[PDB]
Amino acid sequence: CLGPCPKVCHLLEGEKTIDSVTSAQELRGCTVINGSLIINIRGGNNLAAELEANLGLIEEISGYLKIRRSYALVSLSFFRKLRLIRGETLEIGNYSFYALDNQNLRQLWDWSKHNLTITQGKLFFHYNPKLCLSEIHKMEEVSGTKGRQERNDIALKTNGDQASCENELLKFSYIRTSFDKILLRWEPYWPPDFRDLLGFMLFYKEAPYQNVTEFDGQDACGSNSWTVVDIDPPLRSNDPKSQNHPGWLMRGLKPWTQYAIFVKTLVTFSDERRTYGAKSDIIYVQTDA
């Protein structure tokens, strides 16, 4: 046409539940959804390919968008060009975007590329174990909800249980080795407010090979395989050039056995933009003969 003429697809009573391929295919080519969309994908089988072939042309949702109990869906990016959630109808609680119990959701849209404005309504995020807080906070800024001070119900404890989002990187400056004790010292790390550092937490696991990953064990997939040695915060110096490198002497090791080790910061929430925490890479130390 000359002038826009999108394929508006009208939903029964303003809601449509997408559970399988057939439910998604019913919205194939529906560039505008004149209702609310519920995604409830079930089963350990990922349908992201079929969801993008069918839902990936939707660019507007006139109602709310809810993703609840989506197991195999690791990403909402199958909404390949969803740019607007008008929120004319809202999920109870005045929510325009809703995300609950999504067990393997790792990311939303790629906010480095994608845009998604919300005309009205709040954001909701609960019990998304893999989805990081940073992924959600970027949505609050892109969606304009933060730009209109929406009291988004996004519980910090319930999301990003398994994920790790430490922008800062800790580097070990001292690795002395004995047959049963290793002395480590990492760089000094401090949040903007030094009191937000409640402490460090060392994580050392004896490794047969140098292939251990921090996400392994931390995630529910693998049982946790690290020694969570929590460490008190260091007595801070006024002079930044006199901040001694904190460290720990982990005890009771085995002779010439290789340990996989990393250290992480325990930083309390500071509201708004978090002061953020730091984490070291996995380092391998062979102790001594």
């Binding site: 002395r176 004995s178 004790k181 002395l183 010292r185 008190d232 260091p234 007595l235 001694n244 904190p246 460290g247 002497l249």
Partner: protein, 31 residues
Amino acid sequence: SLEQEWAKIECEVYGKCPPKKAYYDWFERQL
């Protein structure tokens, strides 16, 4: 020894100084 090096470190970093310096620790804590 490695423990002795950390013994010093504990006083240096965490303020876990020997019982002989625990007396001095109070003065630092005061004011």
